Design an enzyme around this catalytic site. Structure first.
Site, PDB file in Angstrom:
ATOM      1  N   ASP A 200      61.943 -11.700  -6.444  1.00  0.00           N
ATOM      2  CA  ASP A 200      63.117 -10.907  -6.770  1.00  0.00           C
ATOM      3  C   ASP A 200      63.146  -9.590  -6.001  1.00  0.00           C
ATOM      4  O   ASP A 200      64.271  -9.106  -5.733  1.00  0.00           O
ATOM      5  CB  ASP A 200      63.221 -10.646  -8.254  1.00  0.00           C
ATOM      6  CG  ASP A 200      63.676 -11.824  -9.027  1.00  0.00           C
ATOM      7  OD1 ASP A 200      64.162 -12.821  -8.456  1.00  0.00           O
ATOM      8  OD2 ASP A 200      63.504 -11.800 -10.262  1.00  0.00           O
TER       9      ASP A 200
ATOM     10  N   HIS B 121      43.512  -8.726  -4.032  1.00  0.00           N
ATOM     11  CA  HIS B 121      42.218  -8.059  -3.991  1.00  0.00           C
ATOM     12  C   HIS B 121      42.256  -6.570  -3.747  1.00  0.00           C
ATOM     13  O   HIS B 121      41.222  -5.933  -3.658  1.00  0.00           O
ATOM     14  CB  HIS B 121      41.288  -8.776  -2.999  1.00  0.00           C
ATOM     15  CG  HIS B 121      40.821 -10.098  -3.501  1.00  0.00           C
ATOM     16  ND1 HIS B 121      39.909 -10.195  -4.520  1.00  0.00           N
ATOM     17  CD2 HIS B 121      41.166 -11.368  -3.173  1.00  0.00           C
ATOM     18  CE1 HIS B 121      39.683 -11.475  -4.790  1.00  0.00           C
ATOM     19  NE2 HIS B 121      40.442 -12.211  -3.993  1.00  0.00           N
TER      20      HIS B 121
ATOM     21  N   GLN C 155      46.698 -21.059   0.055  1.00  0.00           N
ATOM     22  CA  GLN C 155      45.310 -20.953   0.445  1.00  0.00           C
ATOM     23  C   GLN C 155      44.524 -22.121  -0.089  1.00  0.00           C
ATOM     24  O   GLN C 155      44.551 -22.398  -1.290  1.00  0.00           O
ATOM     25  CB  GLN C 155      44.685 -19.692  -0.135  1.00  0.00           C
ATOM     26  CG  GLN C 155      45.339 -18.443   0.430  1.00  0.00           C
ATOM     27  CD  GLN C 155      44.678 -17.173  -0.070  1.00  0.00           C
ATOM     28  OE1 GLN C 155      45.351 -16.286  -0.602  1.00  0.00           O
ATOM     29  NE2 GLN C 155      43.381 -17.075   0.112  1.00  0.00           N
TER      30      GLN C 155
ATOM     31  N   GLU D 270      40.796 -23.107  -0.275  1.00  0.00           N
ATOM     32  CA  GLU D 270      39.657 -22.183  -0.180  1.00  0.00           C
ATOM     33  C   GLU D 270      38.463 -22.616  -1.009  1.00  0.00           C
ATOM     34  O   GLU D 270      37.481 -21.878  -1.092  1.00  0.00           O
ATOM     35  CB  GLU D 270      40.065 -20.689  -0.449  1.00  0.00           C
ATOM     36  CG  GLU D 270      41.025 -20.345  -1.611  1.00  0.00           C
ATOM     37  CD  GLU D 270      41.364 -18.853  -1.707  1.00  0.00           C
ATOM     38  OE1 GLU D 270      40.761 -18.089  -0.885  1.00  0.00           O
ATOM     39  OE2 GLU D 270      42.246 -18.402  -2.557  1.00  0.00           O
TER      40      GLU D 270
ATOM     41  N   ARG E 212      50.917 -11.340  -0.994  1.00  0.00           N
ATOM     42  CA  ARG E 212      50.053 -12.166  -1.789  1.00  0.00           C
ATOM     43  C   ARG E 212      50.030 -11.620  -3.214  1.00  0.00           C
ATOM     44  O   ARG E 212      49.536 -10.478  -3.429  1.00  0.00           O
ATOM     45  CB  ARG E 212      48.659 -12.200  -1.190  1.00  0.00           C
ATOM     46  CG  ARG E 212      47.681 -12.954  -2.086  1.00  0.00           C
ATOM     47  CD  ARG E 212      46.449 -13.451  -1.405  1.00  0.00           C
ATOM     48  NE  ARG E 212      45.527 -12.351  -1.099  1.00  0.00           N
ATOM     49  CZ  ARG E 212      44.325 -12.550  -0.575  1.00  0.00           C
ATOM     50  NH1 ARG E 212      43.949 -13.767  -0.159  1.00  0.00           N
ATOM     51  NH2 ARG E 212      43.479 -11.532  -0.417  1.00  0.00           N
TER      52      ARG E 212
ATOM     53  N   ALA F 127      35.382 -16.928   4.203  1.00  0.00           N
ATOM     54  CA  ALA F 127      34.320 -16.467   3.291  1.00  0.00           C
ATOM     55  C   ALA F 127      34.306 -17.204   1.953  1.00  0.00           C
ATOM     56  O   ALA F 127      33.251 -17.622   1.476  1.00  0.00           O
ATOM     57  CB  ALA F 127      34.413 -14.982   3.080  1.00  0.00           C
ATOM     58  N   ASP F 128      35.478 -17.360   1.343  1.00  0.00           N
ATOM     59  CA  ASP F 128      35.587 -18.138   0.116  1.00  0.00           C
ATOM     60  C   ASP F 128      35.187 -19.594   0.330  1.00  0.00           C
ATOM     61  O   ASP F 128      34.522 -20.184  -0.505  1.00  0.00           O
ATOM     62  CB  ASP F 128      37.023 -18.134  -0.407  1.00  0.00           C
ATOM     63  CG  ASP F 128      37.276 -17.062  -1.421  1.00  0.00           C
ATOM     64  OD1 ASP F 128      36.357 -16.584  -2.125  1.00  0.00           O
ATOM     65  OD2 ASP F 128      38.432 -16.681  -1.591  1.00  0.00           O
TER      66      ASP F 128
END
Lengths: 256, 256, 256, 256, 256, 256
Positions: free
Chosen positions: F88, F49, F151, F153, F74, F178-179
């Site tokens: 990697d 995000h 996650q 969610e 993430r 929130a999600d």
């Protein structure tokens, strides 16, 4: 700062106003700012055919932000994750390539909407899209401010034009004549009479649905023709083409 | 790879040939490559009035390298350390701003030559200048392949023009007419008839001393005039100016 | 500039010539240029296992362009949009990882060809691929100058080798022996005698089908062996490995 | 995190320990990290002869930070503002080029010290040097942790060697044999017997002052000789030279 | 776009208005934009004690441009070439460090003004300062919109304060308390009363001379006191310090 | 250097220890290093995000490396190629978004494990993950040091929680409130009790299954509650939010 979202490009589109645009193909924020000083109505930051990373797109949005020209972002593909990235950086108007079916158009709309309407994941609150929380009630505001334009570039896409136009959340349909020409078997020959007839009828069909009709016409005669046919978001050049031509024309004065 | 240095710009200058150039003012390697496809004789990478770091200058040299147009680098000033930096990245033709006296001109030449003759710091063998050792006997080859151009910008420089022209190691003297006009008490927009003879006389004196005479003429009429006077390294445009003007011209076809 | 496309790597491959290559694993344009001064026949810019963005790939192509060593680009995967990106920046030779089936191979070829024959998106005229329009009739010229190499990495790919070799538009098939060894149940350090015949047989089958056979052999003994078997696009080192080993060797002269 | 400054390079130097080093000449943080894994005692990040901006220097410091090798920074010049920049980013050991007189050495020391001892301006509290305030009482701690090494590269510098060695705050004097050779009129010939005699005597003189003696010897035989003569901070290669040689040596196995 | 240059910071300064500021010390355009959403009256982009290149300064100006907060740029030092760079990118308000004499102040002013009255190099017409020519008659408009602030931060400078205040072109005088305290003999062994008296009298003298008085106070109590004394451009924190403190305070809720 | 891979975050996770974290949302290595000086147990570098390229992720890993705080990456999504890239570069702990089914979870695990048991592409030997070969027997050591967090969610994911918990290779399950609230039908029209019950029961189920339970709570009261419920990798803020709040709070002392 202002706590409200606004999308001037979308507002003008909804009123059926003609918006004249320019493709930005260099990836550079330096040239994007220079281009913004010309006062085109819109600037297409081309993440599909120029080698832009998400940071280059960000920088070009920052560069153009104080000027009147409105940015439109085209990602490399209209996938969920790539649409996520450009929405989170605050791109409010998207041009999505290669939309061939109504189902694909519905999935594109879904990628742009939070539940209950779509599958967009939260995060814009701590991103540029909500200006790090300065835009209050972003979730409530966001859908009305987002403008989605889809490209119809294949025989398949044209076959499904009316179904695509009926997809809720699609604001405009764009035809790129060189892509369509190649798909129809007239590659590099969009001026062919068969391709021109299809373009003309398609524009009228798009407008009849109450949606905006878009086009990229690098030749001014073709641009004027598509405007006459009813296109109302029309890009009239590619900045790197105008650059090279201008450089060539100046040099030719001293070699001829 | 080729173990020899070459400097085509310098070779053509020595033959008295006219070389037509373009200012590169965006800092970007992306645009430098596009500009190089036009076939100007030279491209002035402006490290003085555009915000280039030494890495931007490096990337612009890498971008233009496979093309025929020859690069000229202008550093932010002609100091010993800044000249060191641009020489080590393999800039073989320099345009040095604000050379006001023959002593300054001598110091600039010294900054380009290894000890014991000059003051250039040693280190090219681990840099692009000697292509990391692929250029054999770099220190023996280097002076013949380096081309040094200096700008006269001020009243003081004009007063000292004859003495500057007597400095060994200077290949050419450049006049930016806007620089000189301001020094003489006249601003940028609309060139000034009152200073034209001073400019013409100076160009002719440079050539008469057997040095190349350079100029930047953004108006084609003035470029043709300075060429008739004997200027032979002449920049005939600034790429960002050609860009903006081309964008404006294309947009004007659709507005009012 | 030259209006024609050329692909020296492809021309030599077609003649069955042996081409010796080096992996470029640092992402940096600085090192790519230094490597290019060595005169390897090809340089593999590794977009799959080094953290290159599309702009890093662009800069590495700009860096190596004036030198004789020919660039080969490996994207992070052989998807339609990622192949689009690397083709538009003017990568004319691609090494595509993880091609396991003939269907995948066909899809990769399709991703490299314009409609109606393929699915490559149109836009090269405003990109480096057609040098911003300086390459005339790009769409007519392009297929002959594009070279497509695919990697066999898995048991599945080996099972499908004959079918992959029958796919039109594939110029060469590459085997990374560490990839295949892992798939067969054997780790990286010390190559494994048990899989050598499988590797040799596969190389010979590729050549017998009239395609070029590629390999990465970081141990000189294995490189000589794979060359004797008929491999003809052979990478004989990874630049970061050669770098580390050289640094270690120099330091060991002063330590204990 | 630890609230104390430490300078291991300086501690080892003060004990007269031999520290083996490597020049880092690519500007890249990617290669700096790879180089740090070799375990040289020190790494010279060359801001003088490679095109490093202050951000490139920062990034190379970040890259090497978790490893045992200690970084030394050389700025493009030992001016007040350039020394300011590298001290503020937390470079604790500096190699300052072109120090020719004791007065110049005093000015270099002054540029590194806060009042009352020097003229360094505050700001390291909100910079990397004090780790944004995590280093407590930075002003009290800083002088003992800063290591200053100066280059003697001219006939003038050698003339003033004992006076320079008496300057409080100078911890080591470095001789670069190719710079000194050029200054003495033996450019590109540091192996000349006259240059070798001057180097040998100078090392002993430096050590006699209780200061460290430094050298860059790209040839192992010369490195061993300078160590025998008493040099104790000795750089034994340049990373881009070791890279190119390693690339050449691997290629030669397949072309010969 | 608008053909007139405006400098809101200078307009407010001339109207005696109090302007509350924040130091930007990260070099990043990302954080600059976030900071601009807070609504400080001014943001000091610190090119002196943070590792900003001229490109980082350019990007931070682009980032903050559409917001109300006004940028002020501090270059590494107030030299002719460094002032040239920052003026050409369109920094209309400068904070110049280390101004110790009226002669230095006159030289700083000269560096900001075009010939024949100053020494600023011509060229802002093809740069951001004149928005690539959209600002008509830039040389006529510029002096009115340029705002020059100088730092009086040493014992020498305070001795010369009345002389500096009388220099035409100086709009404001800033006092950084940490540097002044150090120079007065109190580096940060607290002897404060002498320093507080000097700050108070200095602020009152600057205002009495009809110029703006500036200060950086990271302790709110000190900021309030300087405001009460008449300071009217007051920076009230350093963004990286506010960031670290906020991160520490949040973590402390969960730890020890 | 040390030839063993270690993952302190995973070691602490296996010992059931509570780890307090912070989200890093600016993309910048500059701020990442500053954040690392605070001593959070973990730092989440958000590639989903925030507009991070793989190079920005690499630079943030380099910046935080010498500090105690452990990085967690993430990616934009948990696809095979995107996981390949981040593994990697040496990201040993991943947070994977949008894991809704056990089949998806098994595919994510497969993407992290070498053939023959997974589908991770071979090549980390010439990459940062194995420190360019300094980590011996990387393929043997790797699984023990890789930590995979997923996650859960969406409403679908919670329905599949027991199935996901039973997937071999999943070390922890994260809940972003929130999600989840949005997916459960409470986008941010507050209907909270249902959501609080689901968070509590989910955390307790995850722990009861012997896996780590994670959460992001920007409100300290909610963080304390999830800790009390058994969450043991808890992020307690987003750095750009803490930054904006601190900037606002400082300005408020001087304004309205």
């Amino acid at each position: 700062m202002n706590a409200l979202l606004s999308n001037p490009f979308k507002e003008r589109l909804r009123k059926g106003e003609v918006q004249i645009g320019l493709w930005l193909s260099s990836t550079t924020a330096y040239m994007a700012e220079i281009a913004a000083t010309s006062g085109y109505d819109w600037l297409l930051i081309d993440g599909e055919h120029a080698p832009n990373t998400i940071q280059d797109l960000y920088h070009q949005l920052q560069a153009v932000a104080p000027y009147a020209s409105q940015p439109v972002i085209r990602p490399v593909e209209g996938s969920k994750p790539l649409i996520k990235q450009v929405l989170d950086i605050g791109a409010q108007t998207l041009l999505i390539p290669m939309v061939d079916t109504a189902e694909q158009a519905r999935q594109v709309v879904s990628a742009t909407r939070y539940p209950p309407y779509g599958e967009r994941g939260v995060g814009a609150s701590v991103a540029r899209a909500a200006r790090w929380g300065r835009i209050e009630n972003y979730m409530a505001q966001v859908n009305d401010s987002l403008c989605l334009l889809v490209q119809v570039e294949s025989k398949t896409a044209l076959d499904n034009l009316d179904e695509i136009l009926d997809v809720e959340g699609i604001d405009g349909v764009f035809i790129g004549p060189a892509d369509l020409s190649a798909s129809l078997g007239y590659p590099d020959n969009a001026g062919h009479p068969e391709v021109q007839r299809i373009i003309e009828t398609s524009i009228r069909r798009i407008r009849a649905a109450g949606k905006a009709a878009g086009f990229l016409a690098v030749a001014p005669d073709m641009a004027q023709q598509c405007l006459a046919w009813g296109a109302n978001f029309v890009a009239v050049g590619v900045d790197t083409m105008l650059y090279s031509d201008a450089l060539d024309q100046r040099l030719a004065m001293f070699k001829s």
